[PDB]
C-alpha positions as CSV (number, residue, x, y, z in Angstrom):
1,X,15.1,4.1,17.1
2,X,16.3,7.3,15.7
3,X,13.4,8.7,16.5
4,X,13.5,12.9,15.6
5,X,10.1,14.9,15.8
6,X,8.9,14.0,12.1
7,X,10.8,11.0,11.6
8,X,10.2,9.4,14.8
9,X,8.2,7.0,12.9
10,X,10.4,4.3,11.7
11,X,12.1,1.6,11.8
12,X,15.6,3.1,13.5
């Protein structure tokens, strides 16, 4: 769910 432009694929 911690989702952040490049990383808002995963898990968080």
């Amino acid at each position: 769910g911690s989702c952040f432009g490049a990383f808002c694929f995963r898990r968080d």
